[PDB]
Amino acid sequence: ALSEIETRHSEIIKLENSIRELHDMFMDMAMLVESQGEMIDRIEYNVEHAVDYVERAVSDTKKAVKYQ
């Protein structure tokens, strides 16, 4: 009984250590993923803007060439 209870105490202290480590690790998870989500959002916006601008650029350049 003594050995079993001592082993259980070791197991519980390991429980708290591991769970707290994983918890801090997880808040880091969340922070990093939110930052990446924001910055990909900005990149997607800029992608759409560039696509539209370059499409109208080709359109007007081809129209100008046709004018020649």
Binding site: Y45, E48, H49, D52, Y53, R56
Partner: protein, 287 residues
């Protein structure tokens, strides 16, 4: 700082020479009609003068110069540039005075909708909704803008954004005591989350909120609603939400404040509650 106010002053002088450019448009462009690029560079100097103003920490002046450049730039050509300038003016006006930011954002919305860009229109609608919520007290306008953005996003199979917009609207409605819309949205989103394995675990909260908004309106239907959620989702009763709800609705059958007061205090003993849920419970359990 004030070395940036000095260049702000010479940016005002640049706006003055742009006034000279419009005077040229008045008088001298009769012979320089081909100087459309002159008007374009006049708009460019307007825009960079607005940029110097922004760097000078004059938000009102920066927004005014941005909107003036946008107005001078929409000469039936390069409409996208005019829309970008208008949204920049709105961003500049977000701080200080955001009222005209609202109108310029509507103008950008109209430009994009005519062009056909729906994602940008919905995002700007969400932006104006949030500026209303954070600046003004009107929620109805924010609710309408969020619903409209959700409609755009669902029109192009952008389901997640519409789902979140509807979730926010339903939460506000439950706080705004419109329980039919809240229950419908909560059950719809719960069923949608149940569809995919990724959001399979989340259905418990949505079912709980739908059941709460059911139980507030018609107490007897609370039993039927919790039952229906349970067979529809066999792993809903196991959830603490369903057990707690059953405890509250069964205690309410007999008039004993101690029972459900102890229940809610125990529930708060394991996890802190939110303003929405706490206010809901305090309102509902009074009668």
């Amino acid at each position: 700082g004030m070395d940036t106010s000095g260049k702000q002053a010479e940016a005002m002088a640049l706006l003055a020479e742009a006034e000279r450019k419009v005077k040229n448009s008045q008088s001298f462009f009769s012979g320089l009609f081909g100087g459309s690029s002159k008007i374009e560079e006049a708009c460019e100097i307007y825009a960079r003068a607005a940029n110097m103003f922004k760097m000078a920490k004059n938000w009102s002046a920066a927004g005014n110069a941005f909107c003036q450049a946008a107005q001078l730039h929409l000469q039936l050509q390069s409409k996208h540039d005019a829309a970008t300038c208008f949204v920049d003016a709105g961003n500049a006006f977000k701080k200080a005075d955001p009222q005209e930011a609202i109108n310029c954002l509507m103008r950008a919305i109209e430009i994009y909708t005519d062009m056909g860009r729906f994602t940008i229109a919905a995002k700007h609608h969400i932006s104006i909704a949030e500026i209303y919520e954070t600046e003004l007290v009107d929620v109805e306008k924010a609710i309408a803008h969020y619903e409209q953005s959700a409609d755009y996003y669902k029109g192009e199979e952008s389901n997640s954004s519409a789902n979140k917009c509807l979730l926010k609207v339903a939460g506000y409605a439950a706080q705004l005591e419109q329980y039919q819309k809240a229950i419908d949205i909560y059950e719809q989103v719960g069923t949608s989350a149940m569809d995919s394995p990724l959001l399979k675990y989340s259905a418990k909260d949505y079912f709980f909120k739908a059941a709460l908004c059911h139980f507030c309106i018609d107490m007897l239907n609370a039993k039927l609603a919790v039952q229906k959620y349970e067979e529809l989702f066999p792993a809903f009763s196991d959830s603490r939400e369903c057990k707690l709800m059953k405890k509250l609705l069964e205690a309410h059958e007999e008039q004993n404040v101690d029972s459900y007061t102890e229940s809610v205090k125990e529930y708060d003993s394991i996890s802190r509650l939110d303003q929405w849920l706490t206010t809901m419970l305090l309102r509902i359990k009074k009668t």
